[PDB]
Point group: D2
Chain length 308, copies 4
């Protein structure tokens, strides 16, 4: 079965993550919920709509959530890359706010059956926990793509999804549900190598082309500032985890969030020190199983086929 | 008319505030919403129920809101003082969460017609703004009892309602609605002097006795640590303001909230310095009109009469 | 009698405080120390030399102390002892009997702090500390902080946290020390080059500041610190606890005082409140007369 | 040749670092400075005197520096120059040619910081700074911070922010410097009271720490700093920017390094990574031999 709710801010990675989730047979996408990111909530939502349509997704609500972080200010493109949007989408946005939507699903289903998988800022997730504390013990677990125990990108020590809303992050990590942090340390191992891209080209389906198109567009921009032999895809990793834990190793360690540091704001602070606790609701992802991971993505694509 | 929503955490002051609001003919109480305080959300809510019943209030929802602050931990009695609760209340709690309730009222009414009057931590108010940004331009204004520009109590520089949830406070003060801060600087002038208490005793109504009972109980505890000739009542002041601005002087000054200080956490930072801006959505209360203020309370009592 | 060590970052008010220090009989000026202020240490030292000459002061060593705050980046005739203010300070205190000197800082506390940490024995020989810094319900560098504290918050934290007796002559008081027209008169009619040197300075930096807007009158600050020394009776004080904010984003460098009431009996800090305009001004004036004309 | 000034807070590792400093031919030990550490300055000085005797060291001045961190509250035969480490330090640097000494701090940076602020001319005479402090992906005092940094964060901030060349021999490296059984052998077979004095100390503080749990082996830290001096080749280093966290609640005192990649060409800081166990240990050992038996 494996029922989830994908909370994301569709830029390249979220799209793959949506594709994988939609395409993998062990996942049941209950919803796609959206959150402000490096692009506005409105833009990110269209993007999600765009993907939904490409992948041929149906009967899965896409709800927009929070347009700004809890407390911090964000204080700072045509379609998605070179892909134009149709004048109108097939898939529309619900009117329930992602937050309100997440609480109902959770509360309307059996306990410990839904996994939350956030791939952007933690704001909706945080709001929902604070708004309906009951959802924290119902949820099966929280598997998120974010943070980095020994690696940063937004900064020397910090990861985007976290620095974006450190309080929401603080809320989420300190609630009691079980939390799996799939951070930069793992994700950086997820390289779309030439052989992989080739394999993708071989699938020859609209969605596969679309994927490569957006990969190409973003990769260039990225691998254009400096040099990346290859770019890594992050978000899908979280989903891959729910499909099959064994796809990476994890470590049980306490992780909390820095809200006050000048240099270390948003750092996901991990304590791998001498006595490791007996009871810890947090864990970090360490090693990726490359072949299995990319097998999963390729599989999802083959199954999606050419919808429409 | 004067439609409001009273967001409070009923301990002594909130009760008077509810009495005044219910009893004054220029106020239309749309709702009583509850928030975690120095007592748990559950306890505070009963207290509100208790008052509602004493005052003979009807058709005004009492909704419970947030049970903890946004990010901080609170990390720390029989009826209400000597007053016992009945086995069951006449007034029940809605099921809409205060937050959800505040958004509907606001959104279901004409723009700029509802005044928010928070008398406890700002958590519900903050949650609702973040959850439905639209409510910020609809609301007439926000008149809150909290803060202190030159006076603290929770600490040397800080006031309870603010130190309790500094982020919620930060959210509220930084949103764009018009905000009137009725802080310790004003409130401390609101003394229940012997003559006043006498005047209250002269009203001779159940609600008046009840008031004195709770006044007495809390006053003793308070005026028992050290010496208060008289205790001041805070919360009602906010309400008095909406009934009639002229009851106190205010000053337009920018006010923001300290979230990082070691000594100054939660301080409502006010800038009364050399060029005062031309456009400022914040203002502070400075001088109380004692006679008019206590006249208002005495009036409300006379009008409430003896309900039931 | 009073022995002091006026620590400062000469510019308008320091200058005056210096004059009043010198020209007042009950003040014995062991030394004039220098600290980086709005201006570069160098400039502040020259300045201090200028004024010294101007006041016809001799036998008072003029030492330059620190040129950058402890941790923060500033970010925006008579000679100079080779002594670094800090060492000079230490000796003077080690070199005299206990509780006889009073430290009179009128810039940031960076020499004072350094000195307390280098030789700790001085906080308990020092008679008491009297600074012109802070504001308990007033700010200038910010809504809440004052120029002297915020420049070197750590330093200030240190000083305020030492066990010695500190008297904070903050903005709350100092904003009473007005330079009003009538005053500009009796000063004018003293006719000493210093008296003039006063108004010259009073005015230049009188306007500028009044210039942005409309400080109907100006106020001196630095002197008030001396004033109190000379005659504690000159202004009122409340003994309240005081500490320095180092981490607030809005409140950095705020002199935080607790006036809440239960009041402790054992308080080593206190704050200036009400000033006796008259007494104050006289003092200043007498001193100007007394200096006469520096041969 | 190498002239250094081993700044330290003697306890187990300092002790060794001292031995290796003395007993190594290429090291010329201008002085031994002392700084408050886990122990009181006093105790740390005595200790240093003990060891000095023990090593049969003479002509090396032993000065006590600061007894409390700059701002934070700690909170929980051979004689002592009357020189305060800080002054002593300043002279030595002012008293010799440019770029000839290397500062080797192995406690908190509070004397180094103070000294940089008192006489600024030293950051540009000093050859380079080599400290045993920090951790870039490792912590001991906390998940992320190391004992030497967190003790005096400001001080460390200062040092790391000065323009001089800093080499941080942090936990990442130092946790390689293991005291393994075989090692405990060749040491045992040196048969000098110092050699013994080593294991005596090695063991007492060997167990204790291994005692809480199970440091199969122990590691020395302080020495590694010396080691590098003696032969930079002894361990690898990466030139990355490094700064000190002063305000994080979880991250205070963290040595924050940026390994992100675009890498600047003009970096004055660098970090220790891989150690040559062998080369390291030899060094230590040779030094023990060379000391022979302190007459
Ligand atoms: K994302
Ligand atoms: K209240
Ligand atoms: K000054
Ligand atoms: K050490």
């Amino acid at each position: 079965a494996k029922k989830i709710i994908l909370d994301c801010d569709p830029g390249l990675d979220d799209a793959v993550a949506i594709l994988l989730a939609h395409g993998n047979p062990e996942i049941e996408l209950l919803a796609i919920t959206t959150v402000v990111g490096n692009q506005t909530l409105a833009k990110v939502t269209r993007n999600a709509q765009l993907v939904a349509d490409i992948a041929g997704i149906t009967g899965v609500p896409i709800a927009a959530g929070c347009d700004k972080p809890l407390v911090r200010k964000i204080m700072t493109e045509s379609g998605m890359g070179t892909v134009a949007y149709p004048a109108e989408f097939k898939n529309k946005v619900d009117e329930r706010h992602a937050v309100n939507l997440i609480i109902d699903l959770v509360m309307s289903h059996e306990p410990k059956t839904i996994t939350l998988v956030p791939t952007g800022g933690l704001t909706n997730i945080a709001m929902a926990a604070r708004l309906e504390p009951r959802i924290v013990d119902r949820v099966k677990e929280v598997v998120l793509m974010g943070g980095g125990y020994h690696e940063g990108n937004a900064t020397s020590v910090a990861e985007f999804n976290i620095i974006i809303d450190p309080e929401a992050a603080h809320i989420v990590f300190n609630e009691s549900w079980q939390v799996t942090m799939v951070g930069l340390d793992l994700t950086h191992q997820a390289l779309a190598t030439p052989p992989i891209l080739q394999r993708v080209k071989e699938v020859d389906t609209n969605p596969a082309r679309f994927m490569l198109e957006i990969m190409d567009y973003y990769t260039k921009i990225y691998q254009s500032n400096r040099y990346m032999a290859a770019a890594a895809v992050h978000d899908p990793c979280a989903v891959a985890y729910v499909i099959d834990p064994s796809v990476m190793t994890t470590e049980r360690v306490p992780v909390d969030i820095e809200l006050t540091g000048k240099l270390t704001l948003g750092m996901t602070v991990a304590d791998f020190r001498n006595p490791r606790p007996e009871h810890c609701h947090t864990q970090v992802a360490v090693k990726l199983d490359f072949e299995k991971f990319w097998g999963l993505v390729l599989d999802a694509l083959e199954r999606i086929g050419d919808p429409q």
